[PDB]
Design a protein around this motif. Structure first.
Motif, mmCIF file in Angstrom:
data_model
loop_
_atom_site.group_PDB
_atom_site.id
_atom_site.type_symbol
_atom_site.label_atom_id
_atom_site.label_comp_id
_atom_site.label_asym_id
_atom_site.label_seq_id
_atom_site.Cartn_x
_atom_site.Cartn_y
_atom_site.Cartn_z
ATOM 1 N N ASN A 297 18.225 -96.843 1.730
ATOM 2 C CA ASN A 297 18.190 -98.203 1.219
ATOM 3 C C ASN A 297 19.414 -98.289 0.312
ATOM 4 N N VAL A 298 20.556 -98.637 0.903
ATOM 5 C CA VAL A 298 21.824 -98.730 0.173
ATOM 6 C C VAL A 298 21.727 -99.346 -1.223
ATOM 7 N N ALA A 299 21.116 -100.521 -1.307
ATOM 8 C CA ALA A 299 20.974 -101.242 -2.568
ATOM 9 C C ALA A 299 20.111 -100.577 -3.634
ATOM 10 N N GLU A 300 18.983 -100.014 -3.210
ATOM 11 C CA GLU A 300 18.054 -99.373 -4.139
ATOM 12 C C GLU A 300 18.531 -97.995 -4.599
ATOM 13 N N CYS A 301 19.033 -97.205 -3.662
ATOM 14 C CA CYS A 301 19.577 -95.915 -4.019
ATOM 15 C C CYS A 301 20.878 -96.050 -4.827
ATOM 16 N N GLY A 302 21.732 -96.995 -4.442
ATOM 17 C CA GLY A 302 22.983 -97.228 -5.137
ATOM 18 C C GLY A 302 22.770 -97.610 -6.592
ATOM 19 N N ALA A 303 21.799 -98.483 -6.826
ATOM 20 C CA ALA A 303 21.479 -98.925 -8.173
ATOM 21 C C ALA A 303 20.914 -97.765 -8.983
ATOM 22 N N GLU A 304 20.129 -96.909 -8.338
ATOM 23 C CA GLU A 304 19.539 -95.768 -9.031
ATOM 24 C C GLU A 304 20.578 -94.714 -9.368
ATOM 25 N N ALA A 305 21.501 -94.475 -8.444
ATOM 26 C CA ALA A 305 22.548 -93.487 -8.658
ATOM 27 C C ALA A 305 23.396 -93.891 -9.861
ATOM 28 N N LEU A 306 23.988 -95.079 -9.778
ATOM 29 C CA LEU A 306 24.843 -95.612 -10.838
ATOM 30 C C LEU A 306 24.089 -95.718 -12.164
ATOM 31 N N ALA A 307 22.845 -96.179 -12.113
ATOM 32 C CA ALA A 307 22.045 -96.294 -13.328
ATOM 33 C C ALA A 307 21.863 -94.924 -13.968
ATOM 34 N N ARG A 308 21.461 -93.934 -13.168
ATOM 35 C CA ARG A 308 21.246 -92.572 -13.665
ATOM 36 C C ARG A 308 22.523 -91.978 -14.249
ATOM 37 N N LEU A 309 23.655 -92.269 -13.621
ATOM 38 C CA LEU A 309 24.933 -91.782 -14.105
ATOM 39 C C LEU A 309 25.129 -92.227 -15.546
ATOM 40 N N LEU A 310 25.015 -93.535 -15.768
ATOM 41 C CA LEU A 310 25.204 -94.113 -17.093
ATOM 42 C C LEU A 310 24.203 -93.633 -18.139
ATOM 43 N N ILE A 311 22.990 -93.280 -17.724
ATOM 44 C CA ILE A 311 22.008 -92.812 -18.699
ATOM 45 C C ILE A 311 21.990 -91.299 -18.907
ATOM 46 N N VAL A 312 22.302 -90.529 -17.872
ATOM 47 C CA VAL A 312 22.303 -89.075 -18.011
ATOM 48 C C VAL A 312 23.626 -88.571 -18.604
ATOM 49 N N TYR A 313 24.708 -89.303 -18.347
ATOM 50 C CA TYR A 313 26.041 -88.970 -18.858
ATOM 51 C C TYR A 313 26.599 -90.236 -19.521
ATOM 52 N N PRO A 314 26.125 -90.545 -20.737
ATOM 53 C CA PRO A 314 26.506 -91.717 -21.537
ATOM 54 C C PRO A 314 27.981 -92.025 -21.679
ATOM 55 N N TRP A 315 28.815 -91.000 -21.824
ATOM 56 C CA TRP A 315 30.244 -91.244 -21.968
ATOM 57 C C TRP A 315 30.807 -92.095 -20.834
ATOM 58 N N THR A 316 30.131 -92.100 -19.688
ATOM 59 C CA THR A 316 30.612 -92.881 -18.550
ATOM 60 C C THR A 316 30.478 -94.393 -18.751
ATOM 61 N N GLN A 317 29.667 -94.794 -19.729
ATOM 62 C CA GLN A 317 29.464 -96.211 -20.026
ATOM 63 C C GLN A 317 30.745 -96.895 -20.484
ATOM 64 N N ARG A 318 31.640 -96.138 -21.117
ATOM 65 C CA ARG A 318 32.885 -96.717 -21.607
ATOM 66 C C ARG A 318 33.756 -97.327 -20.507
ATOM 67 N N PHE A 319 33.526 -96.925 -19.261
ATOM 68 C CA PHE A 319 34.291 -97.468 -18.139
ATOM 69 C C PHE A 319 33.647 -98.752 -17.617
ATOM 70 N N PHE A 320 32.431 -99.023 -18.077
ATOM 71 C CA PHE A 320 31.685 -100.187 -17.616
ATOM 72 C C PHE A 320 31.313 -101.183 -18.710
ATOM 73 N N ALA A 321 32.168 -101.319 -19.720
ATOM 74 C CA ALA A 321 31.908 -102.247 -20.820
ATOM 75 C C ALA A 321 31.784 -103.697 -20.342
ATOM 76 N N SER A 322 32.569 -104.070 -19.335
ATOM 77 C CA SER A 322 32.521 -105.430 -18.807
ATOM 78 C C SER A 322 31.199 -105.761 -18.108
ATOM 79 N N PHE A 323 30.262 -104.817 -18.112
ATOM 80 C CA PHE A 323 28.967 -105.027 -17.469
ATOM 81 C C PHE A 323 27.937 -105.644 -18.395
#
Ligand code: HEM
Ligand code: HEM
Ligand code: HEM
Ligand code: HEM
Lengths: 143, 141, 140, 146
Positions: free
Chosen positions: D19-45
């Protein structure tokens, strides 16, 4: 993979003043003492129980020279590095299973060795050119 | 966290840096920005010119912190507290970069200590820097 | 560093693993050896067959250690003491490998907890594993 | 990049049930929460102050889908991945300066997402084939550093 005239210059020039044997022995020796887990790949070398034993170990010293000598092959083949380190890749990867993170660790150490041996002549621009070379050789080995 | 005899080595190594904080700090940052361009991204407000008053001013603050790290090498977490909070929370510095600064600081020491930057000192200092780097990304959330 | 709440999460993630140590442990190692072949190099004395009594036996010992890690999650260095000494000094395990086992353990949990392996649990468990990995490469 | 019949099979087969949409959202979401420093690249979100805010964030969810969609481009181009991700390389490397270590971190997370979504069907052999694909895509993206 784009080598500038300035870079090639900085690399070649400095290379010409390098004591292959002395720097090679120091690089390899430092690797084994700063990152101990790497000793497990060199058990056939004998005594590596102390930095002293490692520094004096004949095979470490003789091996380091072989290592730096190959870097020299990269120095005079900068545009054809990949092809130059293919075989060595097979050895380190297939035959030996050396994790690539270790290749980078050795490069960092080599940089610190060159700096202690050329001091101020090892300019930030010079460092940047060598750090690039090291990164390229590490990638050539992890093919 | 840290060892013992290493504490003596890093203290030696430090005594050398302690008298050239502004220069060593500035050279460290300059080397980082030059060798790892991507790091400039964290200082969009700075003038990244080699002789910048800003760079030098920062470099001096960086080495000052390390000095205090040495003094409290036995309770690092509680001393670098404010700094980990800044770097982790406020700045979101990717941990990979701490390794980059650490190598540059070591290059500065090797350049000025030459032969005196021995495998033993190198090893003790490398542990110290990695330890310090760990405490800076300790608040990673 | 490890928070209060995370301790609760990893404890509730553990409660799940705690009842399938042998299977989870065995599956973890099998996944590691399969996905990261290079790791086999550390077990030249083992029979690396998927149903190996050895693998299973080891897997059980691995998860047992993690369980004790959970119990003493507030002083891992003094509990994993013997293990760091073994892995660092005796075995010379390259630290890169601890990341590999950690990912495999997490894959095992995700496979069996499905939707219950939430971003929050994932995050708390990932910290716990990285913390444990750190204490194992803390000597030398 | 020596792809075996078995691997291509395990990759393609599983992809078809994703499920491209559901897995994609989970992957990206987990990235930002498990590795917080990555949030700095997504401030415009916008709001990325909590795992809750991140999970519900429309742009995270919509971005994740774009990310997994490209993986799909790799899935049907296995032998020509490098060429396929060149442009994206320039973007992540030149324009964005995303350290490569992060690419690998996302791949690891994607693997954990697929595992939570297929359970037992995500066999060790399957994992090994996907982990290889992830590694290859990460390397294809890190072409602008060298
Ligand atoms: C990027 C830097 C590296 C280069 C250029 C390099 C180069 C070499 C060379 C030229 C040999 C060939 C020996 C021969 O044919 O006579 C060699 C062998 C070997 N290297 Fe590397 N190496 C590198 C990194 C490493 C690392 C990181 C390790 C492990 C910590 C390592 C472990 C070994 C071992 C154990 C051998 C085999 C030694 C033997 O023949 O007994 N090398 N290396
Ligand atoms: C391990 C060595 C490090 C130490 C000890 C250190 C120390 C410092 C100190 C003391 C400050 C200024 C405190 C203040 O004025 O309030 C600071 C700020 C900062 N550091 Fe670090 N730092 C380290 C690593 C890094 C790295 C690797 C980066 C990122 C590439 C970085 C980026 C910054 C930035 C952008 C600031 C804010 C500067 C400003 O306020 O204008 N630091 N650092
Ligand atoms: C982070 C998870 C890890 C934990 C908690 C762990 C735990 C254990 C335990 C409890 C033992 C056996 C103790 C004994 O019987 O005396 C052991 C032994 C060992 N571990 Fe680990 N380990 C970990 C990671 C690894 C990794 C990543 C490797 C290397 C790829 C590894 C390789 C080994 C080997 C070869 C032994 C010796 C086995 C034997 O005696 O036959 N371990 N581990
Ligand atoms: C290996 C996995 C990755 C793939 C396949 C990938 C793919 C993509 C794609 C397809 C886009 C293009 C957006 C468009 O043109 O509409 C994108 C944009 C971007 N990616 Fe990646 N990405 C990866 C990893 C990462 C990582 C690790 C980060 C950083 C933590 C990252 C940060 C971004 C950002 C900030 C953008 C630009 C977003 C925007 O347009 O506002 N990506 N990514």
């Amino acid at each position: 993979v784009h080598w500038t005239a300035e870079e090639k210059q900085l690399i070649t020039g400095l290379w010409g003043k390098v004591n292959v044997a002395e720097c090679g022995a120091e690089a390899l020796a430092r690797l084994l003492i700063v990152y101990p887990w790497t000793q497990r790949f060199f058990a056939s070398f004998g005594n590596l129980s102390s930095p002293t034993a490692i520094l004096g170990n004949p095979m470490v010293r003789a091996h380091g020279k072989k290592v730096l000598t190959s870097f020299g092959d990269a120095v005079k083949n900068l545009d054809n590095i990949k092809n130059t380190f293919s075989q060595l890749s097979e050895l380190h990867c297939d035959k030996l299973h050396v994790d690539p993170e270790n290749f980078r660790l050795l490069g960092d150490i080599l940089i610190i060795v060159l700096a202690a041996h050329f001091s101020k002549d090892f300019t930030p621009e010079c460092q940047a050119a060598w750090q690039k070379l090291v990164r390229v050789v590490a990638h050539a080995l992890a093919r | 966290m840290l060892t013992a005899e290493d504490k003596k080595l890093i203290q030696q190594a430090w005594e050398k840096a302690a008298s050239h904080q502004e220069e060593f700090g500035a050279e460290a940052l300059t080397r980082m920005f030059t060798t790892y361009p991507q790091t400039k991204t964290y200082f969009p407000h700075f003038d990244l010119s080699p002789g910048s008053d800003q760079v030098r001013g920062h470099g001096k603050k960086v080495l000052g912190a390390l000095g205090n790290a040495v003094k409290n090498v036995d309770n690092l977490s509680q001393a670098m507290a404010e700094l980990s909070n800044l770097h982790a929370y406020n700045l979101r510095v990717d941990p990979v970069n701490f390794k980059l600064l650490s190598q540059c600081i070591q290059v500065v020491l090797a350049v000025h200590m030459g032969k005196d930057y021995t495998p033993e000192v190198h090893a003790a200092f490398d542990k110290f820097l990695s330890a310090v780097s760990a405490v800076l990304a300790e608040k990673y959330r």
